[PDB]
A paper describes a structure:
Here, by using the recently developed AlphaFold2 for ab initio structure prediction and validating the predicted model by determining a 1.3-Å crystal structure, we show that VP8*B exhibits a novel fold distinct from the galectin fold. This fold with a β-sheet clasping an α-helix represents a new fold for glycan recognition based on glycan array screening, which shows that VP8*B recognizes glycans containing N-acetyllactosamine moiety.
We used the well-ordered region of VP8*B (residues 83–192) in the AlphaFold2-predicted fold as a search model for MR, and determined the crystal structure of native VP8*B at 1.3-Å resolution. The crystallographic asymmetric unit contains two VP8*B molecules in addition to a short peptide. The electron density of the N- and C-terminal residues are not observed due to their flexibility or a proteolytic cleavage that may have occurred during crystallization. Five of these β-strands form a twisted antiparallel β-sheet that surrounds a central α-helix. Structural comparison of the two shows a high degree of similarity between the models with a Cα RMSD of 0.398 Å and 0.403 Å with the two VP8*B molecules in the asymmetric unit, respectively.
Author numbering: 78 to 202
The structure:
């Protein structure tokens, strides 16, 4: 099980496969002034992902975040990096990620995000 930290580029996956059940993954994203994914501007954010599941025809991540809602840019930057093909459509000022396992969630906003892609999936329980 491999986690990636550093400069994000197209084809990067933050993990190489789904972690085992119960894993909480912290990812902190630091863009520049003009970082774009699929023409959408990326602002900084921190997430603690409790699980990603497939529901119907979408991937659904349940996470705790330092911010009240994620933009489409932040959703795609996160979820594309949880797929085998990895991040796509990223350009502009470099974005860095730090990815780590943490023992317990710390952030205070519970968010559910989805996209019609094939993320790596793992359960919380």
């Amino acid at each position: 099980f491999i986690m990636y930290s550093g400069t994000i580029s197209n084809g990067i996956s933050y993990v190489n496969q789904a972690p085992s059940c119960g894993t909480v993954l912290s990812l902190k994203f630091t863009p520049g002034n003009s970082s774009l994914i699929e023409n959408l501007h990326i602002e900084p954010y921190k997430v603690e992902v409790l699980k990603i599941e497939h529901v119907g025809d979408v991937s659904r991540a349940t996470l705790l975040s330092d911010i009240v809602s994620l933009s489409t840019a932040q959703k795609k930057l996160l979820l594309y990096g949880f797929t085998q093909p990895g991040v796509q459509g990223l350009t502009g000022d470099v974005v860095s990620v730090e990815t780590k396992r943490i023992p317990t969630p710390t952030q205070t906003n519970l968010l559910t995000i989805e996209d019609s892609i094939q993320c790596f999936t793992w359960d919380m329980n």
